[PDB]
Design a protein around this ligand. Structure first.
Ligand SMILES: C/C1=C2/N[C@@](C)([C@@H]3N[C@@H](CC4=N[C@@](C)(CC5=NC1[C@@](C)(CC(=O)O)C5CCC(=O)O)C(CC(=O)O)=C4CCC(=O)O)[C@](C)(/C=C/C(=O)O)[C@H]3CC(=O)O)[C@@](C)(CC(=O)O)[C@@H]2CCC(=O)O
Ligand SMILES: NC(=O)c1ccc[n+]([C@@H]2O[C@H](COP(=O)([O-])OP(=O)(O)OC[C@H]3O[C@@H](n4cnc5c(N)ncnc54)[C@H](OP(=O)(O)O)[C@@H]3O)[C@@H](O)[C@H]2O)c1
Length: 251
């Protein structure tokens, strides 16, 4: 019998959790605990790491998980690799719920770089006004280009000093809206946006906002992850679960 684990942290994961609850599945939602107080989900929620591959193996076994939906961020590549390894070791079925990368349309002015360090190298020499729309974990990389003014967007207020000599943070969590990000990029007079190619619904706003302002985006390509089934849409996840024998409680 069916007991799902949703590895979360995305808008996709939240939409899936709502669906799973509404359809009466037995399921647990998992956060890493990267933020101080993550928003509530409509499933019993675990918070914290598993202890690597071995730890996740152990959890899947003791919890009696039948299926894992990896709905983590596309750039949370360690978690995603760990899930491929732990599910292969235990024989638990796994699908990653991740949408196609975002692709450029009319009016976008995008350049692509392979990783965060290359995004730092992409910035111009002369001081600019750069929206580092990349969260918290890798802000320090931009200490290699300290001359810019940086706009940061952080879930929690910083405790430590920031590694950037000219920076302001907004304290906010998404989902973000086009209206909201337009006003931010205007008010801060941003010249350049740095973004990871998440592909998700929750942080596409900054790209549309940039397009409305005529601004360039330096877009970081997704990191390598080992092969596993990919469920690209919510409907895809629900078909995959049905196909692999997951059923709800029957309420
Ligand atoms: C957009 C977005 C982003 N999150 C960042 C900020 C990444 N999100 C977190 C952790 C995190 N975000 C929360 C709100 C979840 C969401 N963040 C979203 C969603 C809105 C969408 C998503 O990501 O699909 C969403 C889901 C909200 C939902 O619909 O419910 C959350 C839970 C909660 O606190 O309420 C947790 C703890 C998760 C956990 O413990 O498992 C990281 C890891 C830490 C941020 C911090 O501590 O300030 C950071 C990436 C990083 O720093 O490298 C960024 C930049 C990813 C990126 O590069 O795209 C990007 C914002 C880019 C910008 O500013 O445009
Ligand atoms: N760019 C982004 O990561 C972005 C945006 C919104 C959310 N996030 C979310 O923020 C979280 C942290 O991402 P990250 O960049 O730190 O990932 P990561 O580098 O891939 O993960 C590092 C370690 O954190 C633990 N972890 C990650 N996601 C977890 C989850 N959902 N449940 C339980 N443990 C988890 C695992 O620890 P153990 O090996 O100890 O198990 C993992 O090995 C994830 O839930 C992710 O979806 C990331």
């Amino acid at each position: 019998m069916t007991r799902l684990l949703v590895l979360g942290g995305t808008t996709e994961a939240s939409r899936l959790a709502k669906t799973l609850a509404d359809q009466g599945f037995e399921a647990v939602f998992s956060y890493a605990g990267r933020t101080g107080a993550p928003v509530a989900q409509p499933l019993p929620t675990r918070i914290g790491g598993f202890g690597g591959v071995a730890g996740l193996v152990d959890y899947l076994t003791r919890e009696g998980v039948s299926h894992v939906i990896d709905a983590t961020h596309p750039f949370a590549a360690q978690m995603s690799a760990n899930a491929v390894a732990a599910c292969a070791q235990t024989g638990v079925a796994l699908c990653a719920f991740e949408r196609a990368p975002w692709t450029a349309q009319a009016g976008d002015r995008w350049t692509h770089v392979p990783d965060l360090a290359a995004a730092v190298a992409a910035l111009p020499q002369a001081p600019a006004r750069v929206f580092l729309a990349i969260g918290k974990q890798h802000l320090r990389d931009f200490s290699a280009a300290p001359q810019h003014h940086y706009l940061l967007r952080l879930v929690d207020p910083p405790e430590g000093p920031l590694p950037l000599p000219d920076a302001r943070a907004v304290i906010a969590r998404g989902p973000f809206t086009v209206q909201g990000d337009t006003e931010l990029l205007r008010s801060e007079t941003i010249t350049h946006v740095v973004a990871k190619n998440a592909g998700g619904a929750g942080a596409e706003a900054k790209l549309i906002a940039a397009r409305s302002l005529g601004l360039p985006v330096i877009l970081i390509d997704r990191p390598a992850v080992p092969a596993r089934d990919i469920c690209a849409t919510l409907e895809g996840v629900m078909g995959w679960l049905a196909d692999h024998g997951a059923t709800p409680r029957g309420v």
